[PDB]
Structure 1
Amino acid sequence: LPSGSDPAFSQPKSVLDAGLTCQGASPSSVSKPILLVPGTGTTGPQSFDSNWIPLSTQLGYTPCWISPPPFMLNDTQVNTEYMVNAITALYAGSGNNKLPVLTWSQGGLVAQWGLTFFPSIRSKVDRLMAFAPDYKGTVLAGPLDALAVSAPSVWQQTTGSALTTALRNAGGLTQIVPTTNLYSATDEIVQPQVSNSPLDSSYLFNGKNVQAQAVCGPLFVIDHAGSLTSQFSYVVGRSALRSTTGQARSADYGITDCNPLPANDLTPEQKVAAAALLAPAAAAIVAGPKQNCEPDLMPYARPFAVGKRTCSGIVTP
């Protein structure tokens, strides 16, 4: 694990701060914040209005979120600047108190990138609750890269990318704060996820790794969005947030929680939006930026992916 100074941000603080929102509070003065990091093709509200913004509110938190533009499609390393800055702000703004981070898809990759390369926030996050995180990226994005129709962060979320290589070699496939990873074998966005083993993209060593089929059986189906929104996912997420270990506890959930429908406590209209989540995200991706190469690693990450290829060529020491 890197153990030096935080790297400088490439974005100015005013830009990073403007990407951070808390519900009914300024980040500089917020009670019990939880930081929500959204998925590719979405803003914070788009990812979470139908699920963890109201659900975390009803668990006693002030939900906060970042919306790195455009729709989490740009450089995952810049998306992470938004998250690191947000943790620093919300830690201070809540009285120098650790806060939880809850993520969907790329948001989990972002959270682990921040914890890996910005050591100052390790003492500021008490837990990570990642839904369908793609720490290894996804094998499904390869053909899109080959056609040059991939946004910056989609290149970086392809299995074998320079970014996922650097994360792995820097130690980022092992949990850094107590982490729960809730994911599903029947994920049409992030693969591989089927083995219930370290091979899965959502798996972290020493994490609480919860593949839904391992608990609910092989016929249990929640997809990439269901991983975030289902009643089963809510019970695991609530367990992780409430737990004194910082990880969800097997005692808190079981076969009777294996409900694939959107969380019981959501309003009817939140359930509708939760079910449809992938459709607006897919449309935002298709309308967003596209390039023919993976964004360069920032200098702090380059030593961990020597020999991989990005826009400027082959990464050197």
Structure 2
Amino acid sequence: MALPSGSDPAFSQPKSVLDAGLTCQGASPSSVSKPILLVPGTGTTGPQSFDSNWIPLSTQLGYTPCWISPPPFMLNDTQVNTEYMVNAITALYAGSGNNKLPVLTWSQGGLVAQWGLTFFPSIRSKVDRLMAFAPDYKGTVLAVSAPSVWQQTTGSALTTALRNAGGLTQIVPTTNLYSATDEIVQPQVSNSPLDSSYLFNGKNVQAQAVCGPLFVIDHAGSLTSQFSYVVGRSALRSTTGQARSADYGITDCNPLPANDLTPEQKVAAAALLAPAAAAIVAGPKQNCEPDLMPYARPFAVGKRTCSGIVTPLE
């Protein structure tokens, strides 16, 4: 149960700017059948995260894939990245005739989704389910860095605020698929609430818990693998809004890119991380964590951000 209530916080960005960050495949968000919102990882645009995987895969499952691309490559303040997602849900809910829609994410995208659900009450009734691949709700433990990299560092003011506002418990029916061998997000090894991808009451699927302790998929493989596809398909189709254990097993433990992808898509899916690392190298960097927006500050009093130590808010 998330703590924030009442009106949504204001957006810092103009609506036209937020709208500009949203695209659907062969459709307008104003008029779309069975949309799915895809939220990308750090260092990528929507197409860079999903062209080689969930865009074609969700299409083949009968959805219209839509995505956001917060600039620059999800490297700015995670709070701003979230504005794009919240606006997108508002748009896609209305544009599909006031019908709930699923949200599917990679990496930071899951944190963004959960942040949005925690602090923007209006979208809680508009998101049908969340399917998060390698999310980093507790950040990661792995001299200037990107704004959103600060925020995704374990111990950050942002992850502190998410936790203290109730965001480590699922808000909509949620499936989290992740890997103990994740080379970007740790800790992920315990198959328990210690894991960064874990949400209380969520369907938390550590790949090694199903496939065995020596099964290996990395941060990108968590999104792209055939195993990941089978879990994702289950979560999307399920009447409970969560993946079901009966829908997948040891025979689905294929670590290679999803079977239904074209050879070209498979190659691109395998190389998913490279453009992200390049964007991070070349992107904005600073020596402090971005300030929390007013709505989040009450939940991280005592933490230090760029402007200083967060104090109680009247």
Name the counterpart of 2:117.
Answer: 115
Secondary structure, counterpart of 2:279 in structure 1: helix
After TM superposition, give the deviation of residue 149 of structure 1 in Å. Answer: 2.5
Name the counterpart of 1:9.
Answer: 11
Deviations 1:117-145, CA, capped at 9 Å, x for gaps = 00000000010000000000000xxxxxx
Deviations 1:285-317, CA, capped at 9 Å, x for gaps = 111000010000000000000000000000011
After TM superposition, give the deviation of residue 212 of structure 1 in Å. Answer: 0.1
After TM superposition, give the deviation of residue 186 of structure 1 in Å. Answer: 0.5
Report the Cα distance in structure 2 between the residues aligned to 1:54 and 1:148, rounded to whole angstroms.
39
- Write out the 4+ residue segments of structure 1 that deviate beyond 6 Å after TM superposition: none
Deviations 1:57-108, CA, capped at 9 Å, x for gaps = 0000000000000000000000000000000000000000000000000000
After TM superposition, give the deviation of residue 3 of structure 1 in Å. Answer: 1.4
Secondary structure, counterpart of 1:95 in structure 2: coil
Report the Cα distance in structure 2 between the residues aligned to 1:191 and 1:21, rounded to whole angstroms.
32
- Contact 1:41-1:282 at 8 Å conserved across structures: yes
Name the counterpart of 2:265.
Answer: 270
Report the Cα distance in structure 1 between the residues aligned to 2:283 and 2:306, rounded to whole angstroms.
18
Secondary structure, counterpart of 1:209 in structure 2: strand
Deviations 1:224-250, CA, capped at 9 Å, x for gaps = 000000000000000000000000000
Deviations 1:22-70, CA, capped at 9 Å, x for gaps = 0001100001000000000000000000000000000000000000000
After TM superposition, give the deviation of residue 211 of structure 1 in Å. Answer: 0.2
Name the counterpart of 2:178.
Answer: 183
- Contact 1:148-1:293 at 8 Å conserved across structures: no
- Contact 1:215-1:254 at 8 Å conserved across structures: yes
Name the counterpart of 1:92.
Answer: 94
Normalized against structure 2, the TM-score is what? Answer: 0.98
Report the Cα distance in structure 2 between the residues aligned to 1:163 and 1:86, rounded to whole angstroms.
22
- Contact 1:41-1:73 at 8 Å conserved across structures: yes
Name the counterpart of 2:197.
Answer: 202
Give ranges in structure 1 of 5+ residues lacking alignment: 140-146
Match of 1:82 among 69, 84, 89: 84
Q: How many residues align?
A: 310
Report the Cα distance in structure 1 between the residues aligned to 2:6 and 2:119, rounded to whole angstroms.
9
Report the Cα distance in structure 1 between the residues aligned to 2:5 and 2:259, rounded to whole angstroms.
43
Identical residues among aligned pairs (%): 100
Deviations 1:239-266, CA, capped at 9 Å, x for gaps = 0000000000001000000000000000
Report the Cα distance in structure 1 between the residues aligned to 2:273 and 2:211, rounded to whole angstroms.
23
Report the Cα distance in structure 2 between the residues aligned to 1:249 and 1:150, rounded to whole angstroms.
39
Report the Cα distance in structure 1 between the residues aligned to 2:155 and 2:50, rounded to whole angstroms.
29
Report the Cα distance in structure 2 between the residues aligned to 1:169 and 1:316, rounded to whole angstroms.
15
Give ranges in structure 2 of 5+ residues lacking alignment: none
- Contact 1:100-1:128 at 8 Å conserved across structures: yes
Secondary structure, counterpart of 1:55 in structure 2: helix
- Contact 1:127-1:177 at 8 Å conserved across structures: yes
Report the Cα distance in structure 1 between the residues aligned to 2:247 and 2:114, rounded to whole angstroms.
25
Report the Cα distance in structure 2 between the residues aligned to 1:4 and 1:309, rounded to whole angstroms.
27
- Contact 1:17-1:85 at 8 Å conserved across structures: yes
After TM superposition, give the deviation of residue 4 of structure 1 in Å. Answer: 1.6
Secondary structure, counterpart of 2:71 in structure 1: coil
Deviations 1:264-288, CA, capped at 9 Å, x for gaps = 0000010000001111111111110
Name the counterpart of 2:310.
Answer: 315
Report the Cα distance in structure 2 between the residues aligned to 1:37 and 1:23, rounded to whole angstroms.
14
Name the counterpart of 2:284.
Answer: 289
Deviations 1:124-179, CA, capped at 9 Å, x for gaps = 0010000000000000xxxxxxx932100000000000000000000000000000
Report the Cα distance in structure 2 between the residues aligned to 1:240 and 1:265, rounded to whole angstroms.
18
Secondary structure, counterpart of 2:11 in structure 1: coil
Report the Cα distance in structure 1 between the residues aligned to 2:191 and 2:245, rounded to whole angstroms.
16
- Contact 1:137-1:164 at 8 Å conserved across structures: yes
Normalized against structure 1, the TM-score is what? Answer: 0.97
The worse-fitting range, judged by mean Cα deviation, of 31-40 and 276-285 is 276-285
Report the Cα distance in structure 2 between the residues aligned to 1:254 and 1:94, rounded to whole angstroms.
34
